[PDB]
Amino acid sequence: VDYSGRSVITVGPYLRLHQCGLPKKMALELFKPFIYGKLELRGLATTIK
Amino acid sequence: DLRPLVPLDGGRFATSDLNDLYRRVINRNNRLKRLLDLAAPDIIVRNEK
Amino acid sequence: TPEEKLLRAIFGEKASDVKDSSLRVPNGVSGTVIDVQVFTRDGVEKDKRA
Amino acid sequence: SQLKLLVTRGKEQGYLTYAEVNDHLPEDIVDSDQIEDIIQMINDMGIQVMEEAPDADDLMLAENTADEDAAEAAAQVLSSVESEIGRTTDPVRMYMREMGTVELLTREGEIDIAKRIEDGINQVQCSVAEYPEAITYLLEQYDRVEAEEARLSDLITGFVDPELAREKFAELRAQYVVTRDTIHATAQEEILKLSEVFKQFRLVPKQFDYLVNSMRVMMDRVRTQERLIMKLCVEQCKMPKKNFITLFTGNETSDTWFNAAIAMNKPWSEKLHDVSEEVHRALQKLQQIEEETGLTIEQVKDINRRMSIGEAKARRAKKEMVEANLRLVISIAKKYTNRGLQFLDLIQEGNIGLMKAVDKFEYRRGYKFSTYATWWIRQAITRSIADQARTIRIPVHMIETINKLNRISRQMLQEMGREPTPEELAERMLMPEDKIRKVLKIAKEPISMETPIGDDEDSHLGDFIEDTTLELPLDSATTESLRAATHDVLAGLTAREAKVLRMRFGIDMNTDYTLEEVGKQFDVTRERIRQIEAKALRKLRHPSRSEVLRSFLDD
Amino acid sequence: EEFDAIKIALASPDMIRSWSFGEVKKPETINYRTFKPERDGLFCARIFGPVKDYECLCGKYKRLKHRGVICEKCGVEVTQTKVRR
Ligand SMILES: [Zn+2]
Q: What angle do the packed helices D110-130 and D187-198 form, to 10 degrees?
């Protein structure tokens, strides 16, 4: 399944129970298409490349 | 393409097995046709079938 | 292709027959290359670094 | 019945063992192939083991499948296999047992078998010399060949220099024409001279097949005409066998024994009236065949009958000899049992080779047929093991080179001690030092893509070979974006501009055009096209107009 | 392609010919020197379609406009390469 990942889970007590923590790097690797869409929307890159 | 013959690195090819089985069956069909053209004795054609 | 070809025409950029397939570091690691070793089948003129 | 007691114990106890089944089984079979079949049947039966160890706990615990309508058939197969007889399994053993009913010697009985073979070939040879279209075919081939539409050495495969053959062609031409130019005073003498001048020649087997096929077509014509006669008289008019053969025998040429037979005041004569024209046509084709050949249809039948009987005798001698020599074939084919091919495939190649050996044997050089056919068998099996063994097929000379390399590799790998290098093989062998690289690259098998790469959960090498030709979704999105960009750019031109710049390229159309068609469109196959194209190229080179395009530049 | 129930039944012979794209005849697969496919073995070009997308086997026709035309020299219907599947 594309758009997946994994890692070592951990503790993280500073959370309300409706939000799992998550790394910056797994996020920026799972949401590349979303990022690309938003970045061609805000004109921070005229083309997708 | 459901039974490929992928070119692996080094000239070595890594084929599926259905290529092998169909090669066997096509061999035996052609050989049976060849036996029939000659009209071999019945032990030959029987063992071929 | 099409309009890619129009691009080639507008800019004269010649797409070489050469294909980049270099060994680029696996993403995530940041080290110090400590040692390079080169091997050569004995029919190739050894390069400079070898 | 006791094996049925094994069945009921497997039902109750919930399993069995190798010791249990091996206890209850019917004695005296013990081939271990019937055993594996019966064990697979007991597995397919209610019992689902077959065991070794009795149990078994929470690890896959309390398993079962009903599988109704399979138990009643499986137990039936058991009770039937035990009670009747022990059935053979596989097909190599089928072939062994089925040929073991061959009396396995011809110690100089080969001479009688070759006698029968010569009988067949000589009776059919008398048929050859007697078949008129045979000599006409030879004369026609001679003319076609002399002009240069065919070769002399392609038609006939030597007598017992093509100019010798050609003067003999003219000799037999005169013989056949003098046979034909006496139409009944000396016809027998004529055929005698023709036969005795033609019965030391020979042809290609395929030319003889063409002769025999025109002969078979002649027979098919005569048989269809005898159908048109008898199936339209007897089976259409209640003209029984006796009352039809009373006039169908002996002369069998004139129309009288049908037409006048219509007038003999009989029921069949009172039923043949509408089949009169059809049987008239039948006897007319028969007499036209007469016109064709010169010999009565009864002589036609007698000649083809003698030919057929000689052919049957020869085929039967062939069969008898090959049945004998199957043992020889098996013995000689045992010696290649892992070349990359099956035992039965080897022995079938040997069957073909032994047949060719039979077809090309003569005692007139004093050979011993066993050792004679040994060569043909080994050669045919070698040709097969070369041609149709490797997965990707390599040619014969290439296989010879490969086995040369293997022989020399073994010799060097105990001469030099460690092993040889390609630079050393290119001087023990005398190859160009690069063909050896290509040879030892090519001559290896492929890996089985279901190979178990068991270094995982449970995987296969096939599950790890990625796809290379698929276009990245990044690439496809970029392509669509570039289409949109260049479309808006080209819209940012004039109608004539955009049209010429679409046409001279392959943009938004089929394959792209030439200046000939550009001119056939805009009236000017000339510098107007060049002007517009190059000037629009300059116009779109404008930064502030193609900046986005050049941002599409992957540099 | 919201088709229906799926359906299964025996494989009638003339049906098996309607599924066909030309009889396989020979046991070859590839050509041991140029790794194009020999015609016609388990593999092929004219039977099971082209190797490279929109490109003939011998190479006479190599443009998108020529899709559909079967090359007169090796009868390979120039079409996509997923038709090889
Ligand atoms: Zn072609």
A: 130
Nearest-CB residue to D540 (from C2, C10, C42): C10
Task: Inform me whether the C-beta atom of residue D476 falls under 8 Å from chain A C-beta atoms.
Answer: no
DSSP states of E50-80: -SSTT--SSSS--SGGGTTPBPTTT--B---
D35 close to D29: Cβ distance less than 8 angstroms:
yes
3-state secondary structure (DSSP) of residue E46: coil
Strand partners for B13: B7
How far, in Å, CA of D101 to CA of D46, rounded? 40
- Identify all chain B residues contacting D319, using CB atoms and an 8 Å cutoff: 41-42
Closest CA to D552 of C3, B4, B7: C3
- Nearest partner of D361 among D110, D75, D128, judged by Cα: D110
Residue appearing with tokens 């630079």: D423
Question: H or E stretch including D256?
Answer: helix D256-262
Q: Which of E25, E38, E42 to mutate to test the interface with B (most CBs of B within 10 A)?
A: E42
- State the structure-solving technique: cryo-EM
Contact B17 D450 (CB under 8 A): yes
CA of E26 relative to ligand 1 center, distance in Å: 20
Neighboring chain C residues of D479 at a CB cutoff of 8 Å: 1, 4
Q: How far is the CA of E52 from the centre of ligand 1 (A)?
A: 13
Q: Which residues 6+ apart lie within 8 Å of D28 measured at CB?
A: D86
Nearest CA in chain E to B26: E27
Calculate the alpha carbon distances from B36 to B29, B46, D387 in Å. 11, 11, 21
> What is the 3-state secondary structure of D362-427?
CHHHCCCHHHHHHHHHHHHHHHHHHHCCCCCCCCHHHHHHHHHHHHHHHHHHHHCCCCCCHHHHHH
Q: Which residues contact D448 (CB under 8 A, 6 or more apart)?
A: B14, B15, B16, B17, B20, D461
Give SS3 for C29.
Answer: coil
Closest residue to B19, CB basis, from E29, E35, E85:
E29
Q: Around Cβ D373, how many Cβ atoms within 10 Å? A: 26
Whether the bond between D50 and the residue before it is cis, its omega within 30 degrees of 0, is yes
Annotated binding-site members of E for Zn(2+): 56, 58, 71, 74
Helix (H) or strand (E) holding B15: strand B14-15
The tokens 């792209």 sit on which residue?
Answer: D512
DSSP one-letter code for D64: -
Distance from CA of C1 to the nearest CA of D (A): 8
E27 touches chain D (CB under 8 A): yes
Q: Using a CB–CB cutoff of 8 Å, tell me whether E38 touches chain D.
A: yes
Q: What gap in Å lies between CA C47 and CA D449, rounded to an integer?
A: 37
Q: Which residues of B touch E29 (CB under 8 A)?
A: 5, 15, 19, 23
Q: Which residue's entry shows tokens 């169908």?
A: D248
H or E stretch covering D448 = strand D447-448
H-run or E-run covering D163: helix D162-180
